[PDB]
Scaffold this active site. Structure first.
Site, short mmCIF file in Angstrom:
data_model
loop_
_atom_site.label_atom_id
_atom_site.label_comp_id
_atom_site.label_asym_id
_atom_site.label_seq_id
_atom_site.Cartn_x
_atom_site.Cartn_y
_atom_site.Cartn_z
N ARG A 93 38.87 38.40 56.43
CA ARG A 93 38.61 38.69 57.84
C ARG A 93 38.54 40.19 58.09
O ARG A 93 37.75 40.63 58.93
CB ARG A 93 39.66 38.02 58.72
CG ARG A 93 39.51 38.40 60.18
CD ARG A 93 40.40 37.55 61.08
NE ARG A 93 39.77 36.27 61.37
CZ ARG A 93 40.19 35.42 62.30
NH1 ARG A 93 41.29 35.66 63.00
NH2 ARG A 93 39.50 34.31 62.52
N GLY A 132 45.75 38.62 65.00
CA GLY A 132 46.25 37.48 64.27
C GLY A 132 45.80 36.15 64.85
O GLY A 132 45.02 36.08 65.80
N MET A 192 53.81 34.76 61.95
CA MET A 192 54.67 35.09 60.82
C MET A 192 54.86 36.57 60.55
O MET A 192 55.58 36.89 59.61
CB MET A 192 54.21 34.38 59.54
CG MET A 192 54.21 32.88 59.67
SD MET A 192 53.70 32.02 58.16
CE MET A 192 55.05 32.49 57.05
N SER A 225 45.32 28.84 67.34
CA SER A 225 44.58 27.90 66.50
C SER A 225 45.03 26.46 66.69
O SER A 225 44.22 25.54 66.52
CB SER A 225 44.78 28.23 65.02
OG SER A 225 44.37 29.55 64.74
N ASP A 226 46.30 26.25 67.01
CA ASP A 226 46.85 24.91 67.03
C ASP A 226 47.95 24.82 68.08
O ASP A 226 48.70 25.78 68.30
CB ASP A 226 47.39 24.49 65.64
CG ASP A 226 48.48 25.42 65.10
OD1 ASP A 226 48.20 26.59 64.73
OD2 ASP A 226 49.64 24.98 65.04
N1 LIG Z 1 51.28 27.51 63.53
C1 LIG Z 1 51.54 28.64 62.86
N2 LIG Z 1 52.78 28.84 62.37
C2 LIG Z 1 52.99 29.97 61.71
N3 LIG Z 1 52.12 30.95 61.45
C3 LIG Z 1 50.87 30.76 61.92
C4 LIG Z 1 50.54 29.62 62.64
N4 LIG Z 1 49.24 29.66 63.02
C5 LIG Z 1 48.78 30.78 62.53
N5 LIG Z 1 49.70 31.55 61.83
C6 LIG Z 1 49.37 32.86 61.16
O1 LIG Z 1 48.48 32.61 60.07
C7 LIG Z 1 49.22 32.65 58.83
C8 LIG Z 1 49.76 31.28 58.54
O2 LIG Z 1 48.71 30.35 58.39
C9 LIG Z 1 50.31 33.68 59.05
O3 LIG Z 1 49.87 34.97 58.62
C10 LIG Z 1 50.61 33.58 60.57
O4 LIG Z 1 50.96 34.80 61.20
CL LIG Z 2 37.01 35.22 60.77
#
Ligand SMILES: Nc1ncnc2c1ncn2[C@@H]1O[C@H](CO)[C@@H](O)[C@H]1O
Ligand SMILES: [Cl-]
Ligand SMILES: [Cl-]
Length: 240
Positions: free
Chosen positions: A29, A94, A185, A208-209
């Site tokens: 990315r 992020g 994270m 994302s989720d």
């Molecule tokens: N649900 C999630 N829990 C923890 N880290 C996440 C999550 N979604 C995305 N991330 C980010 O993307 C990576 C984990 O997939 C890490 O670098 C983190 O910061």
């Molecule tokens: Cl991307």
């Protein structure tokens, strides 16, 4: 072949990073950001595959580099950037999950401070509570850039965990009770390092989720949310 190593993890020469750096977990990315948004761009690192690039955005020097996953990984790269490369501002760009009932997949979250289950900040402050806190000018630049772009944002706390695959009963309910908007994270490791160096840091993430409802962004939706987030971050660098 052998190049001089200014740090154990980065072959860039001192001076090869701009004073402002965007960092994302995925080095691929970082390459996409450089290729699609930077001009005058050169790759400056590829040690361990952790691609980093330096160029300009609207004429202003800007670098972008991957940081890997987790507090220990970002800590290595950010410590080096602030210390050896003399960087002044890092914005983490992020992705995250959310437990907040009023935060939705694709939302853009601007982080004011980050909790954690890591020990790294207790170790810095005699075992006490040390809030990993974004710099106010950085937060404000992100908020104002999103406003000028007419992109809605959520502003509030993140939680940086060492354990992606959580088995911890009650965690999500507590995070929701106290209105943590983003689960990721790395950000809680970044902010105290910026403090140590008298420098600045912030974080913006796309959802994302949804950890509760299990809603998940499709690949197309993640591309659109990324485009919104990265434009906010890039425009914010012009104010920093
Ligand atoms: N649900 C999630 N829990 C923890 N880290 C996440 C999550 N979604 C995305 N991330 C980010 O993307 C990576 C984990 O997939 C890490 O670098 C983190 O910061
Ligand atoms: Cl991307
Ligand atoms: Cl090494």
């Amino acid at each position: 072949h052998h190049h001089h190593m200014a740090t154990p993890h980065n072959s860039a020469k001192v001076g090869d990073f701009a004073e402002t750096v965007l960092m994302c977990g995925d080095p691929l990315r970082a390459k996409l950001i450089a290729d699609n948004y930077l001009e005058n761009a050169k790759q400056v690192n590829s040690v361990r595959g952790m691609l980093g690039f330096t160029g300009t955005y609207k004429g202003k020097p800007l670098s972008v580099m991957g940081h890997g996953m987790g507090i220990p990984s970002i800590s290595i790269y950010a410590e080096e950037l602030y210390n050896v490369y003399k960087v002044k501002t890092i914005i983490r760009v992020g992705t995250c999950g959310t437990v907040d009932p009023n935060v939705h997949v694709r939302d853009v979250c601007i982080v004011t401070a980050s909790g954690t289950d890591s020990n790294v900040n207790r170790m810095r402050l005699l075992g006490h509570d040390f809030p990993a806190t974004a710099n106010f000018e950085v937060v404000s630049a992100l908020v104002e850039s999103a406003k000028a772009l007419n992109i809605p944002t959520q502003v509030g706390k993140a939680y940086s965990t060492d354990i992606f695959y959580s088995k911890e009963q009650g965690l999500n309910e507590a995070l929701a009770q106290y209105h943590f908007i983003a689960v990721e994270m790395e950000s809680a490791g970044l902010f105290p390092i910026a403090d140590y160096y008298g420098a600045r840091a912030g974080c913006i993430c796309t959802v994302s989720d949804h950890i509760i409802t299990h809603e998940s962004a499709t690949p197309e939706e993640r591309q659109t949310s990324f485009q919104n987030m990265i434009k906010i971050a890039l425009e914010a660098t012009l104010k920093l």
